[PDB]
Design a protein around this ligand. Sequence first.
Ligand SMILES: NC(=O)c1ccc[n+]([C@@H]2O[C@H](COP(=O)([O-])OP(=O)(O)OC[C@H]3O[C@@H](n4cnc5c(N)ncnc54)[C@H](OP(=O)(O)O)[C@@H]3O)[C@@H](O)[C@H]2O)c1
Ligand SMILES: NC(=O)c1ccc[n+]([C@@H]2O[C@H](COP(=O)([O-])OP(=O)(O)OC[C@H]3O[C@@H](n4cnc5c(N)ncnc54)[C@H](OP(=O)(O)O)[C@@H]3O)[C@@H](O)[C@H]2O)c1
Ligand SMILES: NC(=O)c1ccc[n+]([C@@H]2O[C@H](COP(=O)([O-])OP(=O)(O)OC[C@H]3O[C@@H](n4cnc5c(N)ncnc54)[C@H](OP(=O)(O)O)[C@@H]3O)[C@@H](O)[C@H]2O)c1
Ligand SMILES: NC(=O)c1ccc[n+]([C@@H]2O[C@H](COP(=O)([O-])OP(=O)(O)OC[C@H]3O[C@@H](n4cnc5c(N)ncnc54)[C@H](OP(=O)(O)O)[C@@H]3O)[C@@H](O)[C@H]2O)c1
Ligand SMILES: OC[C@H]1O[C@@H](O)[C@H](O)[C@@H](O)[C@@H]1O
Ligand SMILES: OC[C@H]1O[C@@H](O)[C@H](O)[C@@H](O)[C@@H]1O
Ligand SMILES: OC[C@H]1O[C@@H](O)[C@H](O)[C@@H](O)[C@@H]1O
Ligand SMILES: OC[C@H]1O[C@@H](O)[C@H](O)[C@@H](O)[C@@H]1O
Ligand SMILES: [Zn+2]
Ligand SMILES: [Zn+2]
Ligand SMILES: [Zn+2]
Ligand SMILES: [Zn+2]
Ligand SMILES: [Zn+2]
Ligand SMILES: [Zn+2]
Ligand SMILES: [Zn+2]
Ligand SMILES: [Zn+2]
Lengths: 359, 359, 360, 358
Amino acid sequence: MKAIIVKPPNAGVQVKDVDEKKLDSYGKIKIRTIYNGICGADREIVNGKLGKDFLVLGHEAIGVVEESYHGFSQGDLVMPVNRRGCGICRNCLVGRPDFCETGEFGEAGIHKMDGFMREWWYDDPKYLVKIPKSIEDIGILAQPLADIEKSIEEILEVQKRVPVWTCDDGTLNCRKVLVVGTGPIGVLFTLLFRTYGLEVWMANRREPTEVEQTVIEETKTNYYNSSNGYDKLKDSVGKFDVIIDATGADVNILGNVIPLLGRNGVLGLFGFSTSGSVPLDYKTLQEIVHTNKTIIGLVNGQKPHFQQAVVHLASWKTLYPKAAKMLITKTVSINDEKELLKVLREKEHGEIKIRILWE
Amino acid sequence: MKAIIVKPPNAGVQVKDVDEKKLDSYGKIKIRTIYNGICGADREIVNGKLGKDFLVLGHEAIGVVEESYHGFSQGDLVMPVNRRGCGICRNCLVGRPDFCETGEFGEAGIHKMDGFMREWWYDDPKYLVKIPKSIEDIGILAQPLADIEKSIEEILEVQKRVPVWTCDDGTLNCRKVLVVGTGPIGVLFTLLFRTYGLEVWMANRREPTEVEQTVIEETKTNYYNSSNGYDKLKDSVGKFDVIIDATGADVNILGNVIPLLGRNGVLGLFGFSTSGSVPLDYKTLQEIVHTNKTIIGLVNGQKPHFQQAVVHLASWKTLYPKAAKMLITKTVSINDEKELLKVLREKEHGEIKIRILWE
Amino acid sequence: MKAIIVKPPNAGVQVKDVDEKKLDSYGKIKIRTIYNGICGADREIVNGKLKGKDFLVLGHEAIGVVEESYHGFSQGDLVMPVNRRGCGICRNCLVGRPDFCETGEFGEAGIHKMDGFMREWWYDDPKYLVKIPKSIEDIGILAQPLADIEKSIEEILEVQKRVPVWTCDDGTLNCRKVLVVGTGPIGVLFTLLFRTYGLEVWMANRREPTEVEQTVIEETKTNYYNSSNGYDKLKDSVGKFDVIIDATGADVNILGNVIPLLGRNGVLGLFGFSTSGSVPLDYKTLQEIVHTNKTIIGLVNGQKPHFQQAVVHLASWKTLYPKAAKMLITKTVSINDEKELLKVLREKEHGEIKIRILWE
Amino acid sequence: MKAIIVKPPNAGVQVKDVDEKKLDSYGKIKIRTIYNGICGADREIVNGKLKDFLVLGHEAIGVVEESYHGFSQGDLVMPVNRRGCGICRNCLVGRPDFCETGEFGEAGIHKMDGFMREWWYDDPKYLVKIPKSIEDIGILAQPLADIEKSIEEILEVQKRVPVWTCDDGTLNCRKVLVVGTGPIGVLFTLLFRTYGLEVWMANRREPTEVEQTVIEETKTNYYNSSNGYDKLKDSVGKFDVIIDATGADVNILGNVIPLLGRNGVLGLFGFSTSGSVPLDYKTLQEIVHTNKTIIGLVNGQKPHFQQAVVHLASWKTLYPKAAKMLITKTVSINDEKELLKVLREKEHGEIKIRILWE
Ligand SMILES: NC(=O)c1ccc[n+]([C@@H]2O[C@H](COP(=O)([O-])OP(=O)(O)OC[C@H]3O[C@@H](n4cnc5c(N)ncnc54)[C@H](OP(=O)(O)O)[C@@H]3O)[C@@H](O)[C@H]2O)c1
Ligand SMILES: NC(=O)c1ccc[n+]([C@@H]2O[C@H](COP(=O)([O-])OP(=O)(O)OC[C@H]3O[C@@H](n4cnc5c(N)ncnc54)[C@H](OP(=O)(O)O)[C@@H]3O)[C@@H](O)[C@H]2O)c1
Ligand SMILES: NC(=O)c1ccc[n+]([C@@H]2O[C@H](COP(=O)([O-])OP(=O)(O)OC[C@H]3O[C@@H](n4cnc5c(N)ncnc54)[C@H](OP(=O)(O)O)[C@@H]3O)[C@@H](O)[C@H]2O)c1
Ligand SMILES: NC(=O)c1ccc[n+]([C@@H]2O[C@H](COP(=O)([O-])OP(=O)(O)OC[C@H]3O[C@@H](n4cnc5c(N)ncnc54)[C@H](OP(=O)(O)O)[C@@H]3O)[C@@H](O)[C@H]2O)c1
Ligand SMILES: OC[C@H]1O[C@@H](O)[C@H](O)[C@@H](O)[C@@H]1O
Ligand SMILES: OC[C@H]1O[C@@H](O)[C@H](O)[C@@H](O)[C@@H]1O
Ligand SMILES: OC[C@H]1O[C@@H](O)[C@H](O)[C@@H](O)[C@@H]1O
Ligand SMILES: OC[C@H]1O[C@@H](O)[C@H](O)[C@@H](O)[C@@H]1O
Ligand SMILES: [Zn+2]
Ligand SMILES: [Zn+2]
Ligand SMILES: [Zn+2]
Ligand SMILES: [Zn+2]
Ligand SMILES: [Zn+2]
Ligand SMILES: [Zn+2]
Ligand SMILES: [Zn+2]
Ligand SMILES: [Zn+2]
């Protein structure tokens, strides 16, 4: 069977025929892969930045059900949930390994579990998300969008601590979000916050790209060039109710944006920072106490979040059609090894999502 | 009228006769002061660290209702809520200026509002908490305890974000709290978390005082001498579900305890740190993201929290009688000006609460 | 100005020119009506079955066009007004939520205290206007009825936070089953929305499905039960339900028939306004409700956040359920077509979902 | 081993010596019984209205016989009475009050031997620590737990209301009608007043001495409902919460439903024993229009037992007179005539009878 494989912690990636008998199976439903997605997580493991001699790569997949099984019909499109439980803790027991207490969960194509960059795999209906045929083209985004659905859900849950966090009209339309970083993660946070009605400012240390400019205009989102810091933003628009680090940049980015967090606000740490040490002085911390501010680490979406992502992706085909069409940057055939290895190894500037087509 | 007065931002304090006609009144009910309490906030304003020529000091008070008015009867003991709303924002409009969005609230004895260190004042029933005569002796603690009630309420609300944060028995008994600092605040956090059944470790850079040892033994609380850091605690007991900074220590304390925070955990920032700059490196912040950790600034209790505090103080007379008896360190007469000035200007080592008696 | 007017408590309805000076104004933004919707509440007032003025402007479902570029509203923007407005006194109205008004002194456009939106134009306050994307102009009128249902489902889900674990083995609510009693617009919208959220749905009515219902059933993978001879057969085959919605408007004895199908920890959601009958609840039934943590909840009125959520869902359905989405608007009647307009104002046709009025 | 035994569904009760080998064990901790409580459920089984036999009783305080992990010799403990089915997700998180299978056990009622026996073995997970400082009234933590859960659930449900708090951020302005003034009604009243809500107790007679004490000490109101509720409605108006604590004919609900206020909650806690109540379309439509809710309230679990302990401790200070009245009397296990009598029938105005093991 053709599979894209890695050998962690070593760097490297290969597309090669492997013995199906040694690959991980998870249930009774045979699924033939049609699309994989690639993200920075894949790039990390390929570059060695993170029994069996290898691991099947990939945690973003859409496949077709080969034979009808219980609720699933032949020809149905499905997406597997990538993080799976430890089987010990109560959070995993209720289907929520995003809050696993042991840290002994598996992550497909990353840790403990063969991923989905292979011709076909067997899975359990428990871990399969139904992808409507009507979103086959952009449906691969339901996996990354799921992490973002969970994050926004959690931020909203946490803000229930505030007696009234709604606005004069009972909505959240008056709440302002600063999304720091404009890769696929930043763009998806922006799309989803705007879907919920909150005001959004995207920030990056440059002018917008073509894709970003389309998102700006279509979603009625604001943009700030942060190249020379945030003073000018603070002075013009004031402070923000929510700030999202969609970075993975130097952690000093936090020192820059923390002064822009407003009373009762939330700083959501979603990016995985890769460098730096950020100093927080007593004046900054004292002020966080006085104003009921919160900092939250945000990670991993689960099945309900995948299902919510599907609904939102569907909505965006109507609401934000130009942005929706730009979510897929390009598609590489599994049979185009030179190009395939290229895109597995490194991101292109302004890339949103690269899809792998199985054919 | 005798009053304790300060003149911010300048240091200094005076006990003198002032013109009653110029003092702030808040409603129709005349209250004669019997007790005030003193805390670090009073010491700070007296020491110049934080229409009218002066401000009446003091935000912790019990008084007696001089004449019956609606629900309040002559002879009833009452305590005023100290932070009052800005009259503009939706949080203040629902009786919750602890979450004021404008920052234009008042704080008795600190900001905008004359406090309660004066022979009598007029207040509105809406801002008065009924103090049962059976807790007259320790009832003064309801004001500081209210901040702690609000804080624990808030932590427990935030933790609803975790699908299952309860234990195998449906309780929080398995959850571990590290209370850093053992002043009145640390002691009250410890008493209240033990009341709720969570396991508690108190930490300070020394061995326990006699009062702290009584609390330890009576409440079945653990203690850790953190003089040489937290490695030995971490190795023996592991990580904590909740960590409270009750310090008002250099912010580098956060650097010492953040590595002891467990998965899905909460760092509650309650103390107002007064020096230092703490570095947070990328490894620390990335781990916060991976594990759904949260940092929350905790401030100010409101009326429901004062009422809850009354119930808990009442409970502690039965549950923790020895600790309850040690909550009041000494009482100083309003007429003993030398001793009064002494205790207004500086804390005594091991002090929990000084009461001022009006007579 | 042309308006559709009624004179409660009397029956009757007229389309006539009325004095603009007489009609209620709510703010500074001039909005020109393009569409109205008609619902049962409108029918009831027209049939006479539901101070300072000789008449009331009918209608609480509307989409209008913004006449001038105001604050956050551009000329040509489509907007829908929120129909219930607060009492100005109570804490729930002061936070934008008169659905929970404590005084009962709220107003309801085209029903109670406030002129409706079946008129050429009206003035409104931006706070009460919901933006309707041009991309859903055709089905956007459904945002008003769907809002009541968004609120209702939101509330059911909030209430069920009482249950330590109401989610399923996979962390979803996919295993939860809903019985929606009654079809037509409300039942259909409840079914669409519950299916969007992933719960299993059975629709029930005392007959076989209409073509539109059949389309909804098949496209959304919903189940249907012919309840003509009661619910014994459903209970014996499928068992009990986690949520039951009364979308009836009929006799309250329907509740006697479906309460035996409510499962442990379940919610009976009362949304329809029952119009006849008395239902007896015996001690055995009530005791069992106590033993199983069951809840019965009165469900009423959506507010601005719910209107906004409805817009997103309606947009989603164009992709998820395109066949059903098209069938939501049964027909459009011109404001100028008087005989047809009076017909549709006075009576529902069998199988009707939504009739829209077009202002030309 | 001495034990109080019943043979459901048949009527009857005996105190006899029974083969210890036959009795149910639940864990490794040996607990020697000191007190039991008796309630209506006990009387029902005794009267045949609800192994060859079942050990009666689900209200117990026992003493830990040896020092175990977390439990010192001489410690007082109370067992949680309802235990899970081991299958469903609610049971698996320690909350069989919400069991989805109905295959839970209840000590001294079904599936599980009770605690009216000399001693039993239990699992530490099911034991609630009872402070020595509340030994005297501690037996009430079991019935109070059902009520702690009930109020918790009402407050959870009312989060659906955007603002259910008052002008001062409290619930002091919220009014509760507690219908029925038995041990349950009294405990509801005490707990709601502890939380600061206004309470009206109602019964179809004037108050007993004990009820009058609770009324006066807690500043609770009382309404004689002998001739219906119109007078109360005319004077006080409507209520935010109504608790049925009667166990009487369901037509009580028809009388009190018209007194429920906008956004209000009718809490069904009592187990009604007769009747049928008609609900007309006018009443039901009005419930829809005003966001009203009716909720079935049942069973407290471990966190609720622990909360009950704290509140009982608080009442020794807050409401000392009422607290001293919660225990009506104590009967020795060795006084068989009086013991059989109290197992078989409630005395008028009784709150709680305790059985002492000597
Ligand atoms: N927590 C979770 O569950 C989760 C899930 C998925 C991903 N992630 C993490 O989320 C982060 C973002 O993912 P991604 O795939 O969107 O990353 P990406 O493609 O690398 O994009 C990063 C974005 O940040 C911008 N940026 C870099 N430094 C900046 C700065 N100092 N200020 C403002 N913007 C700056 C970059 O600008 P240019 O476009 O000019 O390069 C780029 O637009 C990564 O750390 C990823 O690992 C977390
Ligand atoms: N957020 C709010 O609403 C709110 C309300 C009230 C008070 N506060 C703040 O809460 C903090 C505590 O108040 P308090 O009255 O208890 O203060 P306090 O009387 O000054 O007590 C401070 C405690 O921390 C101990 N400590 C100092 N450095 C430490 C370290 N490095 N590690 C561990 N313990 C250390 C002190 O030790 P020793 O006993 O050896 O001196 C003392 O026990 C203050 O900053 C106060 O301003 C906040
Ligand atoms: N709570 C709120 O905020 C709110 C808002 C809007 C509407 N409502 C109420 O919601 C209800 C439904 O509205 P609608 O506009 O959908 O009403 P509708 O057009 O009258 O439709 C009612 C449906 O119920 C069916 N039905 C009648 N008797 C039945 C029975 N015994 N069993 C099962 N189905 C039965 C009817 O069958 P046929 O199709 O064969 O006639 C029809 O499909 C009405 O009472 C309305 O006033 C409440
Ligand atoms: N849901 C649960 O988890 C749970 C837990 C424990 C108990 N319960 C049930 O809760 C109910 C109350 O328990 P309890 O032990 O307090 O019962 P109880 O001792 O029988 O007390 C019943 C009270 O209701 C009064 N009453 C009777 N009819 C009345 C009426 N029409 N109006 C007003 N009051 C009336 C009785 O009056 P008199 O004093 O004059 O007789 C008595 O005060 C019972 O049904 C019990 O089974 C439920
Ligand atoms: O491995 C950590 C995270 O990596 C991301 O790329 C995935 O989208 C998440 O599902 C995962 O939890
Ligand atoms: O002034 C800030 C804080 O000071 C503390 O001493 C009081 O207890 C708080 O209620 C107050 O909000
Ligand atoms: O019963 C009052 C209700 O009438 C319905 O027609 C409307 O859609 C609701 O918004 C309104 O609250
Ligand atoms: O309905 C059964 C109930 O009986 C009551 O007497 C007990 O206090 C509850 O714990 C139990 O759940
Ligand atoms: Zn990915
Ligand atoms: Zn786990
Ligand atoms: Zn103080
Ligand atoms: Zn304010
Ligand atoms: Zn309508
Ligand atoms: Zn109102
Ligand atoms: Zn009992
Ligand atoms: Zn169970």
